[PDB]
Amino acid sequence: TQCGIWVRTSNGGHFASPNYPDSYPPNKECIYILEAAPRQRIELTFDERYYIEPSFECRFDHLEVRDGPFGFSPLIDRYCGMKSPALIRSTGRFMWIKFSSDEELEGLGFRAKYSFIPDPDPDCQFELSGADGIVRSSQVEQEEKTKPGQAVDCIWTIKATPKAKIYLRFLDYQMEHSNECKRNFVAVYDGSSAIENLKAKFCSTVANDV
Amino acid sequence: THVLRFGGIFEYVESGPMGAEELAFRFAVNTINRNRTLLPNTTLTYDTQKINLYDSFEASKKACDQLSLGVAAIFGPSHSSSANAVQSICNALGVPHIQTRWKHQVSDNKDSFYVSLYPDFSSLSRAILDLVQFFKWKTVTVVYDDSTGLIRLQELIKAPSRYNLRLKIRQLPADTKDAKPLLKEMKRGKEFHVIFDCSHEMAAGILKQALAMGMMTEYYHYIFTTLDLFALDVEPYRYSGVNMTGFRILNTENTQVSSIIEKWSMERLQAPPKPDSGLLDGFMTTDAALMYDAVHVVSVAVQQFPQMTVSSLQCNRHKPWRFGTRFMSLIKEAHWEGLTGRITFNKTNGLRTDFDLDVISLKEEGLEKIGTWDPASGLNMTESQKGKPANITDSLSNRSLIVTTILEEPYVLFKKSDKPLY
Amino acid sequence: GVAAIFGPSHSSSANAVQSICNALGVPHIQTRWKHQVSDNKDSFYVSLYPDFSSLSRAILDLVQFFKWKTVTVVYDDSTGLIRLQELIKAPSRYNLRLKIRQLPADTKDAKPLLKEMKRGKEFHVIFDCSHEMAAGILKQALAMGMMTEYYH
Amino acid sequence: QLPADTKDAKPLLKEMKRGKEFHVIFDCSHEMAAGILKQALAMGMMTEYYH
Ligand SMILES: *[C@@H]1O[C@H](CO)[C@@H](O[C@@H]2O[C@H](CO)[C@@H](O[C@@H]3O[C@H](CO[C@H]4O[C@H](CO)[C@@H](O)[C@H](O)[C@@H]4O)[C@@H](O)[C@H](O[C@H]4O[C@H](CO)[C@@H](O)[C@H](O)[C@@H]4O)[C@@H]3O)[C@H](O)[C@H]2NC(C)=O)[C@H](O)[C@H]1NC(C)=O
Ligand SMILES: *[C@@H]1O[C@H](CO)[C@@H](O[C@@H]2O[C@H](CO)[C@@H](O)[C@H](O)[C@H]2NC(C)=O)[C@H](O)[C@H]1NC(C)=O
Ligand SMILES: *[C@@H]1O[C@H](CO)[C@@H](O)[C@H](O)[C@H]1NC(C)=O
Ligand SMILES: *[C@@H]1O[C@H](CO)[C@@H](O)[C@H](O)[C@H]1NC(C)=O
Ligand SMILES: *[C@@H]1O[C@H](CO)[C@@H](O)[C@H](O)[C@H]1NC(C)=O
C-alpha cells in the first residue's frame, strides 16, 4: 500500500515495487489495482532487476499477476524466483497485481512497462461509498450492466468513510438454487479482492451478518 | 588420409576371456570399418591396453604410452579411482576422454575434455523419485552396496524434506553375498518397498536370497536402479506375484538394435556357461552398449572434421594437442541414434542428462514395458491395460431409493443455515 | 629421492599420489579425510584425520544423549553423505527422523534454505560444514530468527 | 486334487492362493511332495502365513 511508483499517463502506466530500487519491507501486501482503460493488450514488461524471493513453489514472496480486476480470476503465474519474467500478453481489459511478502526476507522488487497496441474490441463495478447506503442485486437490472439471459458477475466495492470499519447486514437474501455454490453465491471479500481474505461465502438459505 | 587411432584402456583378466567392454569396443571399430557409408574415406585403428582397474599409476602409464604413440581419443578406464587419473591427463594434453560409466564429479574440478555416456544420476534419481510417487509410496527402504551409492541416489535421500516419504536407508554387507542377516531385519520391520542400488550381477544374488526367505509375494515391491534388469533371469520369480519395476535404456524394440544384439551373442562365442549365477544367456549389457555408442558418437565428430592429424604427445613435455579444442566441441554437439536411444550431451558439463528410458515391470509373461520416462515430460506411462479377466465390487440392495419429495412447510423445508449443506 | 610424501590433501589428487607411492613403495601420509574406495588394495598409505566411521558414531551417541527424535542433517557437497553414513543409516535401527538437506552450490546464501528449516519447525541441526563456512551460516542464522534457546 | 500324473500344480495353487487357503494337508508321497514345494516356492506360497 506504500507502493510509490505508479505513474499513470495515458499510455505508460509505469509502476514499480515499494521502495524501488532499494528494497521492500517485510509484511508488505501491495495490491496494484491497474484500472486499465480499454485498449492495449495489457502489458507486463519487467525490468531485469529481480529479487522476488526464490522460495519453493512460490509458497511465499510472490507476484500474483492474476488476470482479473479482482482476486478469484484466471491465474497467470506466481512469479517468484531469480530470473525476471517478461511480456505477458493477456487480452483482458484489466490486470490485478498482488505483490506480497513474508517476515524474514530480502528484496529489491520489480519494475513494469505498459501499453501494447490493439483495439478495445460482466462489468458491474458498483462503487459505493460514504455512510449507510443500499446494496441491491437488482442494480444490475435497473442499470443495464447485464441483460436477462446470461451469467452475471458483479463487484460491489463499499469504500468506507475515512477512518472506519464496515458492518454488513442482510435485509433480503434469497437464492434461486439454494445450498449450491457452483451456480450462485455471495462472497464478502474484505480488504481487496483476493482468495486469501475471503470472509464469508454464502450460497445456502441464510446469510449471517459479517 | 592417414587413417586414425583411437585409444582404449580396459580390464586385465588373467585366464578368462576378454571383458564385455573391450570386446564391444573391438566390435564397434570393426563394424564401422565394414559399413563404408559412415566414414567413407577413413578407417579406424585401435590400440587397447589392459590395467588393473584399481591402480591409477598403471592407468597413467598406459595413457601416456598411447599419447606418446599418438591417439585421437581415450575410451575410459571405467573406474572412479583410475578414470580421474586419466581425465587429468587428457585435459592436460587436450585429447578427448570418453567415459562410459558413472563417476563422482568433484564439484570444483575444472575439466573440459571429458564426456560421459552413462545416464547421469541427477536424472535417474529423479526418475526413481517420479516412480515412488506414481506408486503412491510412503515408506521406501533404499538399499545400496558401497559408500558411493549415496552420491548416486542423492536426489532420493533429500526427498522426504520436500515430499511425504520415509527413507530407511540400509546397506548390504561388505563383499559377502549374504544379505540374509539384512533381509531378516527388513522382514521383521515390515518393509515392503525396496529401492535396491546394486549392479545386475549382484541384484541376481539378492533375489535368490530373497526367495529363500519369504520376501517374494505380492506384498513386496522392488524398484531397481540398474539398467541391466532386462538381462536378469526371472523365470523362478515370474509366477510369484511380485512387482519388480526397473528401467531400461537399451532400446530393444527397434529392429536395427535387435539385429546388432543377435550379431553380438553370435560373435561372442566366448560366453561361459554359468547356471549358478542367476542371469540369462549372453546379452549385450548396458555397460557394453554404451561402449558401442561411444565409438559411433566420436565417429560422427571425425566425419564432420577431415582435418585431424593425430600427433604424438609426450606427458613429460607438456604441450596441448592442436585440433583437440575444436574436436572436443564436435563431440559435445553431436547427435546419434545408437543402441541406447538418442545420445545428446549437456553443454555445461558433458554429461547425458537428456535420454529416453523405458519403465519395465514384472508381469506373468516376463519383463514388459509399461511406461516411458523422459526429463522434459515425466512418466508418460501406457498404464491402461486389462490382461486378466475382470471382477466386480458392487451389487444389488445397495440401491438407494430415489424419494421424490416436494417442499412445503412444515412437511418438507430447507434448513436455515449459512454454510453450504448438501 | 624422498623418504615420504605428505599428501596433496584432496580427493581428486590424493588418490593419484597414493597409487604412485604404492607402486614405488614409499609411504604416503595423509592429513585429511578421503573416500576409500572399498576395493582398493593399497598398503603404503596412512591417514591422520579422524575417520568418519568413528566421528559419525560420536555424533550418533550425541543425538541420543540429548534425546533427540528429529534431526535435520545439513551437508554441503555430495561427499558429505559418505562421511555421515552411520548417521544416515541410524533411523533403521533407532528411533530418529532424518530430514537431510543441502546448502546451495557455492553461494553462501542459506537464507532460502533457513526459511524452510524455520517453517518446518526444525530445531535440531547437524551441520557438516568446514569451519570457514560454518561461520557464514551462523551469521545468516542470526540475521534470521534461528538463534534462540529452542535451536540446537 | 492334484492333476492326473503331470507334476504341474500351478493351475491348482493359483486357486488355493486366490481362495485364501493357508492351511493345507497334502497327501502325497515324498517323491511328489518335493515337486509341489518347488512349485509352491515358484509361486508366493512359502511365507509365514502358510502352514
Ligand atoms: C544439464 O542441463 C539441464 C537442462 O538441460 C540443467 O538443468 C537441470 O536439470 C533439471 C532440468 O529440468 C532441473 O531439475 C528440474 O527442475 C524443475 C524446476 O526447475 C526450477 O525450479 C525452481 C523454480 O521454480 C528453481 O529453484 C530451480 O533452480 C529451477 O530453476 C522441476 O520442474 C523438475 O521436476 C521434475 O519432475 C517433474 C514432476 O512435476 C517432471 O515434470 C519432470 O520429471 C522434471 O524432471 C526438476 O526438479 C535441475 O534443477 C536443473 N539444474 C541443476 C543445477 O541440476 C542442468 O543444470 C545441466 N547439468 C546437470 C548436471 O544436470
Ligand atoms: C504387480 O503385480 C500384480 C500381480 O501380482 C500385477 O497385477 C496384474 O497385472 C495384469 C497386467 O496385465 C492384470 O491383467 C491383472 O489383472 C493384474 N492382477 C492380477 C491379480 O493378476 C500388477 O500389474 C503389478 N503392478 C505393476 C505396477 O507392474
Ligand atoms: C550401414 O549403415 C546404415 C546407416 O546409415 C544402415 O542403414 C545400413 O543398413 C548399414 N548397412 C550395413 C550393410 O551394415
Ligand atoms: C573422400 O575422398 C575425396 C577425394 O579422394 C576427399 O576429397 C574427401 O574428403 C573424402 N571424404 C569424404 C567424402 O568424407
Ligand atoms: C504419451 O505417449 C503416447 C504414445 O502412445 C501419446 O499418445 C501421448 O500423447 C503421450 N503423452 C501423454 C501426456 O500421454
Coordinates of C-alpha atoms in Angstrom, one line a residue, chain B residues 50-374:
Chain B
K50 CA 45.0 -53.6 -20.0
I51 CA 45.3 -52.2 -16.5
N52 CA 44.4 -53.5 -13.0
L53 CA 41.4 -51.1 -12.7
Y54 CA 42.4 -50.2 -9.1
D55 CA 45.9 -48.8 -9.8
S56 CA 45.8 -45.3 -11.0
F57 CA 49.6 -45.3 -11.6
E58 CA 49.2 -48.1 -14.1
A59 CA 46.4 -46.3 -15.8
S60 CA 48.5 -43.2 -16.0
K61 CA 51.4 -45.0 -17.7
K62 CA 49.2 -46.8 -20.3
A63 CA 47.6 -43.5 -21.1
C64 CA 50.9 -41.8 -21.6
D65 CA 52.0 -44.8 -23.7
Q66 CA 49.1 -44.3 -26.1
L67 CA 49.6 -40.5 -26.2
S68 CA 53.3 -40.9 -26.9
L69 CA 52.4 -43.4 -29.6
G70 CA 49.7 -40.9 -30.7
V71 CA 46.0 -41.4 -30.4
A72 CA 42.8 -39.5 -31.1
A73 CA 40.7 -40.3 -28.0
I74 CA 40.9 -42.3 -24.8
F75 CA 37.8 -44.5 -24.2
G76 CA 38.0 -44.7 -20.5
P77 CA 39.5 -47.0 -17.9
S78 CA 36.0 -47.1 -16.3
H79 CA 36.6 -46.8 -12.6
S80 CA 36.4 -43.9 -10.1
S81 CA 40.0 -44.4 -8.9
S82 CA 41.6 -44.5 -12.3
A83 CA 39.2 -42.6 -14.5
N84 CA 40.0 -39.4 -12.6
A85 CA 43.7 -40.1 -13.2
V86 CA 43.3 -40.4 -17.0
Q87 CA 40.9 -37.5 -17.2
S88 CA 43.5 -35.1 -15.9
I89 CA 46.0 -36.4 -18.4
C90 CA 43.5 -35.9 -21.3
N91 CA 42.8 -32.4 -20.1
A92 CA 46.5 -31.5 -20.0
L93 CA 47.3 -32.9 -23.4
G94 CA 44.0 -31.8 -25.0
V95 CA 42.8 -35.2 -26.3
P96 CA 39.2 -36.1 -25.6
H97 CA 38.4 -38.7 -22.9
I98 CA 35.1 -40.6 -23.4
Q99 CA 33.7 -42.1 -20.3
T100 CA 31.2 -45.0 -20.4
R101 CA 30.4 -45.4 -16.7
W102 CA 29.3 -43.0 -14.0
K103 CA 32.0 -41.3 -11.9
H104 CA 31.8 -38.9 -9.0
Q105 CA 32.4 -35.4 -10.4
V106 CA 34.2 -33.5 -7.8
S107 CA 32.3 -30.2 -7.6
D108 CA 35.3 -27.9 -8.1
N109 CA 37.0 -29.8 -10.9
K110 CA 37.6 -27.5 -13.9
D111 CA 37.9 -30.1 -16.7
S112 CA 36.7 -29.6 -20.3
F113 CA 38.0 -32.6 -22.3
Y114 CA 35.8 -35.3 -20.8
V115 CA 32.4 -36.6 -22.0
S116 CA 30.2 -39.2 -20.3
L117 CA 27.7 -41.6 -21.8
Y118 CA 26.3 -43.3 -18.7
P119 CA 22.9 -41.7 -17.8
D120 CA 23.7 -39.2 -15.1
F121 CA 22.2 -39.8 -11.7
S122 CA 20.9 -36.3 -11.5
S123 CA 18.3 -37.7 -13.9
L124 CA 17.9 -41.4 -12.9
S125 CA 17.4 -40.4 -9.3
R126 CA 14.5 -38.1 -10.5
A127 CA 13.0 -41.0 -12.5
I128 CA 13.0 -43.2 -9.4
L129 CA 11.5 -40.3 -7.4
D130 CA 8.8 -40.0 -10.0
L131 CA 8.3 -43.7 -9.8
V132 CA 7.9 -43.8 -6.0
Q133 CA 5.2 -41.2 -6.3
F134 CA 3.3 -42.8 -9.2
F135 CA 3.1 -45.9 -7.0
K136 CA 1.9 -43.7 -4.0
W137 CA 4.5 -45.0 -1.6
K138 CA 5.2 -43.5 1.8
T139 CA 7.9 -45.8 3.3
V140 CA 10.8 -46.7 0.9
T141 CA 13.8 -48.7 2.1
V142 CA 16.8 -47.8 -0.2
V143 CA 19.4 -50.5 -0.1
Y144 CA 22.8 -49.6 -1.6
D145 CA 26.0 -51.6 -1.7
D146 CA 29.1 -49.4 -1.4
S147 CA 29.5 -45.9 0.0
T148 CA 29.5 -44.3 -3.4
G149 CA 25.8 -45.3 -3.7
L150 CA 24.8 -42.4 -1.5
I151 CA 26.2 -40.0 -4.1
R152 CA 24.2 -41.7 -6.9
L153 CA 20.9 -41.6 -5.2
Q154 CA 21.2 -38.2 -3.6
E155 CA 18.1 -36.7 -5.0
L156 CA 16.2 -39.6 -3.4
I157 CA 17.9 -39.1 0.0
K158 CA 16.9 -35.5 0.1
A159 CA 13.3 -36.3 -0.9
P160 CA 11.5 -36.6 2.5
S161 CA 12.4 -32.9 3.2
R162 CA 10.2 -31.7 0.3
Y163 CA 7.7 -34.6 0.0
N164 CA 5.9 -37.1 2.3
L165 CA 8.2 -40.1 2.3
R166 CA 10.1 -42.1 5.0
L167 CA 13.5 -43.2 3.9
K168 CA 15.0 -46.0 5.9
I169 CA 18.4 -46.4 4.2
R170 CA 20.3 -49.7 4.7
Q171 CA 23.5 -51.3 3.3
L172 CA 24.4 -54.7 2.1
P173 CA 27.4 -56.5 3.7
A174 CA 31.0 -55.7 2.7
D175 CA 31.7 -58.1 -0.2
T176 CA 30.0 -61.2 1.1
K177 CA 26.8 -62.0 -0.8
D178 CA 24.9 -62.9 2.4
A179 CA 22.0 -60.4 2.7
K180 CA 20.1 -62.9 4.9
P181 CA 21.1 -61.1 8.2
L182 CA 19.9 -57.9 6.4
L183 CA 16.7 -59.4 5.0
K184 CA 15.6 -60.7 8.4
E185 CA 15.6 -57.1 9.6
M186 CA 13.7 -55.9 6.5
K187 CA 11.1 -58.6 7.1
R188 CA 10.6 -58.0 10.8
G189 CA 10.5 -54.3 10.2
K190 CA 7.6 -54.6 7.8
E191 CA 9.5 -53.0 4.9
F192 CA 7.6 -53.8 1.7
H193 CA 9.0 -51.2 -0.8
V194 CA 12.7 -51.5 -1.6
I195 CA 14.9 -49.4 -4.0
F196 CA 17.9 -51.7 -4.5
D197 CA 21.0 -50.0 -5.9
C198 CA 23.0 -53.0 -7.0
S199 CA 24.6 -54.0 -10.2
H200 CA 22.8 -56.7 -12.2
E201 CA 25.4 -59.3 -11.3
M202 CA 24.6 -58.8 -7.6
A203 CA 20.9 -58.0 -8.0
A204 CA 20.5 -61.6 -9.0
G205 CA 22.2 -62.8 -5.9
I206 CA 19.9 -60.9 -3.6
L207 CA 16.8 -62.2 -5.3
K208 CA 17.9 -65.8 -4.7
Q209 CA 18.3 -64.9 -1.1
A210 CA 15.0 -63.0 -1.1
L211 CA 13.3 -66.1 -2.5
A212 CA 14.9 -68.4 0.0
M213 CA 13.3 -66.2 2.6
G214 CA 9.6 -65.3 2.4
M215 CA 10.1 -62.0 0.7
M216 CA 8.7 -62.8 -2.8
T217 CA 5.0 -62.5 -2.5
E218 CA 2.5 -59.9 -3.9
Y219 CA 3.2 -57.6 -0.8
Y220 CA 6.8 -56.8 -1.7
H221 CA 7.7 -54.4 -4.5
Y222 CA 11.3 -53.9 -5.6
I223 CA 12.4 -50.9 -7.7
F224 CA 15.8 -51.4 -9.1
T225 CA 18.3 -48.8 -10.2
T226 CA 20.4 -50.8 -12.6
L227 CA 19.7 -50.7 -16.3
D228 CA 20.5 -54.3 -17.0
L229 CA 17.3 -55.6 -15.4
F230 CA 16.2 -56.9 -18.8
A231 CA 19.1 -59.3 -18.8
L232 CA 18.1 -60.8 -15.4
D233 CA 16.7 -64.4 -15.2
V234 CA 13.2 -64.1 -13.9
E235 CA 11.7 -67.5 -14.6
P236 CA 11.7 -68.6 -10.9
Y237 CA 10.2 -65.2 -9.9
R238 CA 7.6 -64.8 -12.6
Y239 CA 4.7 -66.5 -11.0
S240 CA 5.3 -65.2 -7.5
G241 CA 3.0 -62.3 -7.9
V242 CA 5.8 -59.8 -7.0
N243 CA 6.3 -56.4 -8.6
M244 CA 9.8 -55.7 -9.9
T245 CA 9.9 -52.3 -11.6
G246 CA 13.1 -51.2 -13.2
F247 CA 14.4 -49.1 -16.1
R248 CA 15.9 -49.8 -19.5
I249 CA 17.8 -47.5 -21.8
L250 CA 18.9 -50.3 -24.2
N251 CA 16.3 -49.8 -26.8
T252 CA 15.4 -53.4 -27.6
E253 CA 12.3 -52.7 -29.7
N254 CA 13.9 -51.1 -32.8
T255 CA 14.8 -53.9 -35.2
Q256 CA 18.1 -52.4 -36.1
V257 CA 19.0 -52.5 -32.4
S258 CA 17.9 -56.1 -32.0
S259 CA 19.9 -57.1 -35.2
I260 CA 23.1 -55.9 -33.5
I261 CA 22.4 -57.9 -30.3
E262 CA 21.8 -61.0 -32.4
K263 CA 25.2 -60.3 -34.0
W264 CA 26.6 -59.6 -30.6
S265 CA 25.9 -63.0 -29.0
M266 CA 26.8 -64.7 -32.3
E267 CA 30.3 -63.1 -32.3
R268 CA 30.5 -63.6 -28.6
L269 CA 31.1 -67.3 -28.6
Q270 CA 33.3 -66.9 -25.5
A271 CA 30.2 -66.6 -23.3
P272 CA 30.7 -69.0 -20.5
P273 CA 28.0 -71.4 -19.2
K274 CA 27.1 -70.2 -15.8
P275 CA 23.8 -71.5 -14.3
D276 CA 24.6 -70.8 -10.7
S277 CA 24.8 -67.0 -11.4
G278 CA 21.1 -66.1 -11.9
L279 CA 21.4 -64.3 -15.2
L280 CA 20.2 -65.1 -18.7
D281 CA 22.3 -66.1 -21.7
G282 CA 24.8 -63.7 -23.4
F283 CA 23.1 -60.4 -23.8
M284 CA 24.6 -57.0 -24.5
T285 CA 24.6 -55.4 -21.1
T286 CA 24.2 -51.6 -20.8
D287 CA 27.9 -51.4 -20.0
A288 CA 28.8 -52.9 -23.4
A289 CA 26.1 -50.9 -25.2
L290 CA 27.5 -47.6 -24.0
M291 CA 30.9 -48.5 -25.4
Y292 CA 29.3 -49.4 -28.7
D293 CA 27.7 -45.9 -28.8
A294 CA 30.9 -44.2 -27.7
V295 CA 32.7 -45.3 -30.9
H296 CA 29.8 -44.1 -33.0
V297 CA 29.4 -40.7 -31.4
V298 CA 33.0 -39.9 -31.8
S299 CA 32.9 -41.2 -35.4
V300 CA 30.3 -38.5 -36.1
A301 CA 32.8 -36.0 -35.0
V302 CA 35.6 -37.3 -37.2
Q303 CA 33.1 -37.3 -40.1
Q304 CA 32.5 -33.5 -39.7
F305 CA 36.2 -32.8 -39.4
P306 CA 38.5 -34.2 -42.1
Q307 CA 41.5 -32.1 -40.9
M308 CA 42.5 -34.2 -37.9
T309 CA 46.2 -35.2 -37.9
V310 CA 46.9 -37.5 -35.0
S311 CA 50.1 -36.2 -33.3
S312 CA 52.4 -37.8 -30.8
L313 CA 52.3 -36.1 -27.5
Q314 CA 54.7 -36.7 -24.5
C315 CA 53.4 -36.3 -21.0
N316 CA 56.8 -35.1 -19.8
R317 CA 57.0 -32.4 -22.4
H318 CA 53.7 -30.7 -21.7
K319 CA 52.1 -29.3 -24.8
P320 CA 48.4 -29.3 -25.7
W321 CA 47.4 -31.0 -28.9
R322 CA 46.4 -28.8 -31.8
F323 CA 43.0 -29.9 -33.2
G324 CA 41.5 -31.1 -29.9
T325 CA 39.9 -27.8 -28.9
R326 CA 37.6 -27.9 -31.9
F327 CA 37.3 -31.7 -31.8
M328 CA 36.0 -31.7 -28.3
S329 CA 33.3 -29.3 -29.3
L330 CA 32.2 -31.5 -32.2
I331 CA 31.7 -34.3 -29.8
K332 CA 29.5 -32.2 -27.5
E333 CA 27.1 -31.0 -30.2
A334 CA 26.9 -34.5 -31.7
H335 CA 23.6 -36.3 -32.0
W336 CA 23.4 -40.1 -32.7
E337 CA 20.7 -42.7 -32.7
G338 CA 22.6 -45.5 -31.1
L339 CA 21.5 -48.6 -29.2
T340 CA 20.7 -46.7 -26.1
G341 CA 18.3 -44.3 -27.7
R342 CA 19.1 -40.7 -28.5
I343 CA 22.6 -39.5 -27.5
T344 CA 22.9 -35.8 -26.7
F345 CA 25.3 -34.2 -24.2
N346 CA 24.7 -31.4 -21.7
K347 CA 26.8 -28.4 -22.9
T348 CA 27.6 -27.2 -19.4
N349 CA 29.3 -30.4 -18.2
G350 CA 29.5 -33.1 -20.9
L351 CA 27.1 -35.5 -19.2
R352 CA 24.0 -37.2 -20.6
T353 CA 21.1 -35.6 -18.7
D354 CA 18.6 -35.9 -21.6
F355 CA 17.7 -39.5 -22.6
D356 CA 14.7 -41.8 -23.1
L357 CA 14.1 -44.5 -20.5
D358 CA 11.6 -47.4 -20.7
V359 CA 10.0 -48.4 -17.5
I360 CA 9.8 -52.2 -17.4
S361 CA 8.0 -54.3 -14.9
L362 CA 7.4 -57.9 -13.9
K363 CA 4.2 -59.5 -15.2
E364 CA 3.4 -63.2 -15.6
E365 CA 4.8 -63.2 -19.1
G366 CA 8.3 -61.8 -18.2
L367 CA 9.5 -58.2 -18.2
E368 CA 7.2 -56.0 -20.2
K369 CA 7.5 -52.3 -20.9
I370 CA 4.7 -50.4 -19.1
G371 CA 5.8 -46.8 -19.4
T372 CA 8.3 -44.2 -20.7
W373 CA 10.3 -41.6 -18.8
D374 CA 11.7 -38.5 -20.4

